[PDB]
Design a protein around this ligand. Structure first.
Ligand SMILES: *[C@@H]1O[C@H](CO)[C@@H](O[C@@H]2O[C@H](CO)[C@@H](O[C@@H]3O[C@H](CO[C@H]4O[C@H](CO)[C@@H](O)[C@H](O)[C@@H]4O)[C@@H](O)[C@H](O[C@H]4O[C@H](CO)[C@@H](O)[C@H](O)[C@@H]4O)[C@@H]3O)[C@H](O)[C@H]2NC(C)=O)[C@H](O)[C@H]1NC(C)=O
Ligand SMILES: *[C@@H]1O[C@H](CO)[C@@H](O[C@@H]2O[C@H](CO)[C@@H](O[C@@H]3O[C@H](CO[C@H]4O[C@H](CO)[C@@H](O)[C@H](O)[C@@H]4O)[C@@H](O)[C@H](O[C@H]4O[C@H](CO)[C@@H](O)[C@H](O)[C@@H]4O)[C@@H]3O)[C@H](O)[C@H]2NC(C)=O)[C@H](O)[C@H]1NC(C)=O
Ligand SMILES: *[C@@H]1O[C@H](CO)[C@@H](O[C@@H]2O[C@H](CO)[C@@H](O[C@@H]3O[C@H](CO)[C@@H](O)[C@H](O[C@H]4O[C@H](CO)[C@@H](O)[C@H](O)[C@@H]4O)[C@@H]3O)[C@H](O)[C@H]2NC(C)=O)[C@H](O)[C@H]1NC(C)=O
Ligand SMILES: *[C@@H]1O[C@H](CO)[C@@H](O[C@@H]2O[C@H](CO)[C@@H](O[C@@H]3O[C@H](CO)[C@@H](O)[C@H](O[C@H]4O[C@H](CO)[C@@H](O)[C@H](O)[C@@H]4O)[C@@H]3O)[C@H](O)[C@H]2NC(C)=O)[C@H](O)[C@H]1NC(C)=O
Ligand SMILES: *[C@@H]1O[C@H](CO)[C@@H](O[C@@H]2O[C@H](CO)[C@@H](O)[C@H](O)[C@H]2NC(C)=O)[C@H](O)[C@H]1NC(C)=O
Ligand SMILES: *[C@@H]1O[C@H](CO)[C@@H](O[C@@H]2O[C@H](CO)[C@@H](O)[C@H](O)[C@H]2NC(C)=O)[C@H](O)[C@H]1NC(C)=O
Ligand SMILES: *[C@@H]1O[C@H](CO)[C@@H](O[C@@H]2O[C@H](CO)[C@@H](O)[C@H](O)[C@H]2NC(C)=O)[C@H](O)[C@H]1NC(C)=O
Ligand SMILES: *[C@@H]1O[C@H](CO)[C@@H](O[C@@H]2O[C@H](CO)[C@@H](O)[C@H](O)[C@H]2NC(C)=O)[C@H](O)[C@H]1NC(C)=O
Ligand SMILES: CC(C)C[C@H](NC(=O)N[C@@H](CCC(=O)O)C(=O)O)C(=O)O
Ligand SMILES: CC(C)C[C@H](NC(=O)N[C@@H](CCC(=O)O)C(=O)O)C(=O)O
Ligand SMILES: *[C@@H]1O[C@H](CO)[C@@H](O)[C@H](O)[C@H]1NC(C)=O
Ligand SMILES: *[C@@H]1O[C@H](CO)[C@@H](O)[C@H](O)[C@H]1NC(C)=O
Ligand SMILES: *[C@@H]1O[C@H](CO)[C@@H](O)[C@H](O)[C@H]1NC(C)=O
Ligand SMILES: *[C@@H]1O[C@H](CO)[C@@H](O)[C@H](O)[C@H]1NC(C)=O
Ligand SMILES: *[C@@H]1O[C@H](CO)[C@@H](O)[C@H](O)[C@H]1NC(C)=O
Ligand SMILES: *[C@@H]1O[C@H](CO)[C@@H](O)[C@H](O)[C@H]1NC(C)=O
Ligand SMILES: [Ca+2]
Ligand SMILES: [Ca+2]
Ligand SMILES: [Cl-]
Ligand SMILES: [Cl-]
Ligand SMILES: [Zn+2]
Ligand SMILES: [Zn+2]
Ligand SMILES: [Zn+2]
Ligand SMILES: [Zn+2]
Lengths: 693, 693
């Protein structure tokens, strides 16, 4: 038969390995010829695998590249202006790749040009609370200083935003061994650790969902009208550059001024971690000078879009998407995900050649320019937003399949919790010691839910990946899954470095490609069920449970300020009422879904439309404050860390640091406004599940 | 059988007459007890007529009322400050109503309080071009002056906005006999003309679609958080009051300064129509003083919502809605429409009692507080926006059924043109001389299309009525129809006056209620077809024809500036390309709609969803510039006259008066941006009609 078991059994570890090798021999940087050639290859292969149509969708978007004849670097300069120490111009290439052409040197994409010179302030992870500690407690002024921050904990674009608002004139980002060197493991090529010359690339935008900085709201097609640079979205105002820990040690060792305020400020290098400003007395006249010469450039990018037309509901789309562009070789990021998508397409195509079609249409996507700010997925969704909002059932992401080899990680909408528990109970665990047991059993054992016994942890969707437009802008139920470590926002040690190669994966992460196969089964199995189940596999009651958890959470935050809640009459009663109503209505809808006349395809589709439009109901067309492309009222990326999800984000940001606002009546008024918007949106989403007439 | 003929034959002129009499014996001002009682009566009657459910939906919204113990009036004051002339405190009540309680005196709803005193400038109709003529050509400065403007031509809220921006400190609105006294007809009670003591009530907001001024975006429910007055939407900044032509003559007769610039500035009173400022030499020391004491007040309003559940597609809604609140008796506005809705409900209920149900759900609405800014319809749509955007098939409005007795008037989306031509060919003409001929024949003969021989005129939807939220905010296909005169934006002579009574209609407009019956057949027949036709009765090819007409029109406007189009490379090629593509794709969709396997209900509903979501595709979630609740890219209310529709409004407003902008590069850049947005939206709407996979 053609059922999910036939699909899953066709997936092969050895195929995923072959595809990964094939995708990682040369760099595939967005906007380069090599990445266009790989796009054409995937288009051709998906056609041969049997998809109905496979097209390239191109856009011309703002990208950023170093200047090949005017390299970026940082110096220590003495009082005469001689450069006595320079940081590296490139990472030492790994064995056997020392002659590979077109490895982009480490840089921070979208940095402006400049050569600022000044004194160093060390700002730990450059988090909002790190800057609070510096200004408010230690009384250190970052204005006109160059800040040096360690990578880790939060998205680097938030670090740069925080440094700008502190008045910094430049930012140096570096990888501390505390965060990127696991104890007892060797440096690449002899293990999976970051060597001292390794450096993490990455963009430093603050797009808040906008996509291409020059075309917010509309696809960057041939006739698009572009903002000028000065009005672009999300560009940093100060120069930024990343370095490795050999170079950081040279910048940090001479630091003077104030001692670190506590041990959470100290990394693992043999330096004091002094906050500064500037260097100890002997070197007090030396300064640090950046030299950044990168350029922003409108450049063509290419998404591959494959279609497998549905047999019964061709106007309902289940999307499996992940990116193709990499910083260098992309051994983990993204090609361990792209190889998994390739094998899933191949498997679905095998069934199609034998005469099967899924019930609903499946769309497969290979996105471009993700590393430069989710640009390819966002421009495509801008072009196709009307089709997606009326027809989009679900989006399953497919970036890196592995970030470790310990257990499964799933982040998704509550609407998919039941689907994921049920599927993982049917899959075999690949873990040592769990031979013959389910993936559900190994996952629940290694990653227990903090809330429920005998359940696994499933996280909120945050951002920093290509589901953002589909979930937080358009309100399409979304999910992601990968194998993970036992620190989740800092990246694995060789993240975005030249050392992330096929050999890294084959030698140190997944020699038998069994974790890749398990992830292919989870992502593919989810797509299969979403595209084939007669009734969509969403359980609205799971949203009711989480809404109550998030309401309790945000109420608890507010209750730290009881005097103000009395003065300004701040009540959460309306939000709890809406959550209670959602719980009651979802329970009654679930009974009808179980009970309805199963011979009636209009009641079924009516009820399938109620399930599909439930995530859509949490969208507010006015967006969140000053972030028009984050429209979901229950979930947004954290305003302090794009990678993390925040619940009831409008109320959360209205309450954050509220005790510091100079006009408390205005600040608590805005808390009340956000409570009203959240209560109304929960009630309105509940009412979409009521009987329709 | 139960078919459209059974529905239409059940409608009775005599029933419409009985209901009109019943609805017009006492005033039904929004927010008053009498209007709540009428809402309860209609709820009870719709239940008895046989609807499945009938509920009141209430909201607490900002309304405005005069102060009963501190009356509004205008004076001429002499140099000592004695008030030598006062305008009336009330309209003389009509025969037999001189003892009716609670007639609200003439006032401009939402005027602020004040007692400004100054010199008079006469500004004709206070249109944008009238103010251009005064400032630019005649060099008259309105700053610190009281302006006097005649009603007519444009919505009075636009007149007040224009007067504010000219620096006026108050506005006096009056009815000139040129616009409100037809030659050879007697004044009320002896004919349908405005007497000299008659006055037009009406609000002077500039809401731009927002609804309740205090709650833009969200329903004004029990827990709503309200803007403060200073941040409310759309409130005027200067006092405003309306007067009749006996009083206007006293204010205008003493005017001096400049002569009227031409005859288009002169009305029909025996005065010079001097523009001012101020009075002729003998009276040069007299001034005009306003006394406005009205108050804005959050007040409860009540919509009645009736449901007739669909037999096959209960999750598809066809809405028939019109308002119930009136300024005084509402003999024409709205009760000639509300009586027609009442008879339509009664007829559908007769069929239902015999066992019939429509295919799709029909919703019937009696809206409140329309006269205060479309508040009841807009708050309800804000509450129910998710249901409406995913399920709303069409909205048919039902305000005044008559504004004359000459011929039919229809304004609607192009998607309903074919429906209207086909229905009116099946209906009998009620017109003298067309006995035995179709309504299509009489209408086409009396109101020929300016574009096509043998076709009738159908206008764009403008605004100033309760379809605005459904069409321009939410993108639901909408239409309206009424009997009309042979000046369409000024209102009939007794518009919004105490003289608009049952006797006005029964004696002078429609003694046999035949025009009311014809309008009931058109509105009811449209609802019937939309709710019962297997394939939705929309023709996408009609949108293609009009899009080309509007593209030619906006290109022609731009081509008045050939030098600038050369300098700034302003091309319309992308918009014509999108319109050509829409034409081709709509032609192919129409072939499939005719050809598809008619046994397949999923292809049918898939294709019905493509038809329903086509109007929805013209919505831009970012809205038009500075008007976030006007989201349709093809149609918006004119920025110069809310009642009129404008096509390609984003490009139109970017081009308007562009030769006066101080930075032409910036102004033509914004023209190009609006061309890009319009081209993209037309192409994206076209693509919703392509094969789905
Ligand atoms: C009305 O409908 C038509 C389709 O019938 C649309 O036509 C498209 O028009 C655009 C022009 O705006 C064409 O864009 C061009 O695409 C070329 C590559 O196309 C190939 O590859 C894609 C896969 O991604 C296929 O879809 C396609 O069939 C082709 O196989 C580019 O090479 C072109 O860019 C080059 O020329 C331009 C202009 O000189 C330069 O600015 C560039 O730098 C570059 O050198 C260009 O981008 C597109 O191919 C057409 N599609 C077709 C025929 O299917 C219209 O766009 C549509 N109107 C609107 C308003 O949408
Ligand atoms: C969770 O779900 C429940 C329903 O199970 C919703 O309950 C509604 O709650 C509101 C309160 O916010 C109630 O509003 C009150 O309505 C009264 C009139 O109700 C009658 O008429 C309507 C027809 O319009 C019917 O729908 C209804 O069944 C009743 O027949 C008003 O008189 C009340 O106003 C008075 O009291 C308040 C508070 O003291 C004053 O501020 C006012 O000035 C006034 O004196 C009030 O507006 C509503 O009736 C409830 N509906 C029910 C039970 O069906 C919850 O609202 C919902 N939670 C959320 C967040 O939506
Ligand atoms: C994850 O798996 C769980 C466990 O299988 C699953 O929950 C189960 O769903 C089924 C529906 O397939 C439920 O079975 C129903 O139970 C009610 C009450 O006992 C019956 O009335 C239902 O009978 C109707 O429907 C049948 C078809 O399903 C017809 O044969 C019948 O004639 C009736 O029309 C029906 O049997 C079962 O109760 C739950 N078990 C639970 C909740 O413990 C869950 O749905 C899966 N999650 C997904 C798919 O997302
Ligand atoms: C307004 O009225 C006009 C005039 O009636 C109407 O246009 C007509 O619509 C009918 C569809 O009902 C068209 O008839 C079709 O013509 C094509 C080509 O000749 C045929 O292939 C079609 O046959 C298929 O469908 C039939 C059911 O309709 C089946 O019996 C058959 O087996 C095939 O499946 C079909 O007969 C007719 O051509 C037009 N006439 C025109 C455009 O002049 C218009 O639709 C009405 N507007 C509305 C309802 O909004
Ligand atoms: C990755 O695999 C692809 C597909 O097998 C290879 O591209 C093919 O290469 C052969 C030999 O040059 C050609 O005859 C085909 O036309 C290519 N097919 C396609 C679809 O492009 C490619 O060589 C492999 N890359 C690496 C680095 O091994
Ligand atoms: C760090 O790099 C800089 C730039 O290449 C070096 O300084 C240059 O040295 C050359 C040759 O002596 C001079 O002609 C240039 O004028 C210098 N440029 C600048 C900008 O100072 C510097 O020598 C390097 N420092 C170390 C320690 O290697
Ligand atoms: C308008 O018609 C309604 C409905 O016939 C009248 O209200 C009814 O009046 C009688 C007598 O007072 C009562 O017994 C009923 O309870 C009322 N019914 C409803 C549904 O309200 C009303 O009197 C009429 N109004 C006028 C001005 O004629
Ligand atoms: C117009 O109305 C005003 C206000 O009622 C009249 O002026 C008042 O006259 C009374 C009685 O003589 C005085 O006690 C008040 O002080 C006056 N009020 C003001 C504001 O001036 C005025 O007489 C009326 N004019 C005409 C021509 O009827
Ligand atoms: C390793 C995690 C924390 C981040 C990783 N995502 C990314 O690397 N995204 C890129 C682009 C993110 C964006 O621009 O939003 C970045 O963070 O530089 C992932 O989701 O696998
Ligand atoms: C008589 C026409 C021009 C206007 C009439 N509409 C109205 O009277 N609407 C009211 C409220 C309009 C609004 O606030 O937008 C008004 O114009 O004062 C109608 O559409 O029948
Ligand atoms: C890069 O640097 C070179 C050499 O200094 C210079 O000539 C050129 O202008 C720069 N290129 C770009 C693209 O800015
Ligand atoms: C930090 O330094 C700058 C200039 O040196 C100054 O303008 C700013 O107010 C300072 N902030 C403090 C002391 O908080
Ligand atoms: C793979 O698993 C083993 C066993 O737990 C572990 O020691 C090793 O660190 C893992 N490799 C990676 C890259 O995490
Ligand atoms: C209306 O005017 C009276 C009498 O001058 C005054 O006492 C009252 O304050 C006013 N009422 C309102 C509602 O403003
Ligand atoms: C109109 O008058 C006011 C003050 O009397 C002045 O500020 C304004 O600039 C004048 N405008 C002109 C003369 O255009
Ligand atoms: C009704 O129709 C007649 C005949 O054309 C016309 O003279 C009269 O003015 C009409 N009444 C109204 C109110 O227009
Ligand atoms: Ca864009
Ligand atoms: Ca509102
Ligand atoms: Cl992922
Ligand atoms: Cl109307
Ligand atoms: Zn990635
Ligand atoms: Zn990455
Ligand atoms: Zn009206
Ligand atoms: Zn009116």
């Amino acid at each position: 038969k053609h059922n999910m078991k036939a699909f899953l059994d066709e997936l092969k570890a050895e195929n995923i390995k072959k595809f990964l090798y094939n995708f990682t021999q040369i760099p595939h940087l967005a906007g380069t010829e090599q990445n266009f050639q790989l796009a054409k290859q995937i288009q051709s292969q998906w056609k041969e695998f049997g998809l109905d149509s496979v097209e390239l969708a191109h856009y011309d978007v703002l990208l950023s590249y170093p200047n090949k004849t005017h390299p970026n670097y940082i110096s220590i300069i003495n009082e005469d202006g001689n450069e006595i120490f320079n940081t590296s111009l490139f990472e030492p290439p790994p064995p056997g790749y020392e002659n590979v052409s077109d490895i982009v040197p480490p840089f921070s994409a979208f940095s402006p040009q400049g050569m600022p010179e000044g004194d160093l302030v060390y700002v730990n992870y450059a988090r909002t609370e790190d800057f609070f500690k510096l200004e408010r407690d230690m009384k250190i002024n970052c204005s006109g200083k160059i800040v040096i921050a360690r990578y880790g904990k939060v998205f680097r674009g938030n670090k740069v935003k925080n440094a700008q608002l502190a008045g910094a004139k430049g930012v140096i980002l570096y990888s501390d061994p505390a965060d990127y060197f696991a104890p007892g493991v060797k440096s690449y090529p002899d293990g999976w650790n970051l060597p001292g010359g390794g450096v993490q690339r990455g963009n430093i935008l603050n797009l808040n969902g906008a996509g291409d900085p020059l075309t917010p709201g509309y696809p960057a097609n041939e006739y698009a009208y572009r903002r000028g640079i000065a009005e672009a979205v999300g560009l940093p105002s100060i120069p930024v550059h990343p370095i490795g820990y050999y170079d950081a040690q040279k910048l940090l060792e001479k630091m003077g001024g104030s001692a670190p305020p506590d041990s959470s400020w100290r990394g693992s290098l043999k330096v004091p971690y002094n906050v500064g400003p500037g260097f100890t007395g002997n070197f007090s006249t030396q300064k640090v000078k950046m030299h950044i010469h990168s350029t922003n450039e409108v450049t063509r990018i290419y998404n591959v879009i494959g279609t497998l037309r549905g047999a019964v509901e061709p106007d309902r789309y289940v999307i499996l998407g992940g990116h193709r562009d990499s910083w260098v070789f992309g051994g983990i990021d993204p090609q361990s995900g792209a190889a998994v998508v390739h094998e899933i397409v191949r498997s679905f195509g095998t069934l199609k050649k034998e005469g099967w079609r899924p019930r609903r249409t499946i769309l497969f996507a290979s996105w471009d320019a993700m590393e430069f700010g989710l640009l390819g997925s966002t421009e495509w969704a801008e072009e196709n937003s009307r089709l997606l909002q009326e027809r989009g059932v679900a989006y399953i992401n497919a970036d890196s399949s592995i970030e470790g080899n310990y257990t499964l990680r799933v982040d998704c909408t509550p609407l998919m919790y039941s689907l994921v528990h049920n599927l993982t109970k049917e899959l075999k665990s690949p873990d040592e010691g769990f031979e013959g047991k389910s993936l559900y059993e190994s996952w629940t054992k290694k990653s227990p839910s903090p809330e429920f016994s005998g359940m696994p942890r499933i996280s909120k969707l945050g951002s920093g990946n290509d589901f953002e437009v589909f979930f937080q802008r358009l309100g399409i139920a979304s999910g992601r899954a990968r194998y993970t470590k036992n620190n989740k926002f800092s990246g694995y040690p060789l993240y975005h470095s030249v050392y992330e190669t096929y050999e890294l994966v084959e030698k140190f992460y997944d020699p038998m490609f069994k974790y890749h196969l398990t992830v292919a089964q989870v992502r593919g199995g989810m797509v299969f069920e979403l595209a084939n189940s007669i009734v969509l596999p969403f359980d609205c009651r799971d949203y009711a449970v989480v809404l109550r958890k998030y309401a309790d959470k945000i109420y608890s935050i507010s209750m730290k300020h009881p005097q103000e809640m009395k003065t300004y009459s701040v009540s959460f009663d309306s939000l709890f009422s809406a959550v209670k109503n959602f719980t009651e209505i979802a329970s009654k809808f679930s009974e009808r879904l179980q009970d309805f006349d199963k011979s009636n395809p209009i009641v079924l589709r009516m009820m399938n439309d109620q399930l599909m439009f439930l995530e859509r109901a949490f969208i507010d067309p006015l967006g969140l404050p000053d972030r028009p492309f984050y429209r979901h009222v229950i979930y947004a990326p954290s305003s302090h860390n794009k990678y993390a999800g925040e619940s009831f984000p409008g109320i959360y940001d209205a309450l954050f640091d509220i005790e510091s606002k100079v006009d408390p009546s205005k600040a608590w008024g805005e808390v009340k406004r956000q409570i009203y918007v959240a209560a109304f949106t929960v009630q309105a989403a509940a009412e979409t599940l009521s009987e329709v007439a």
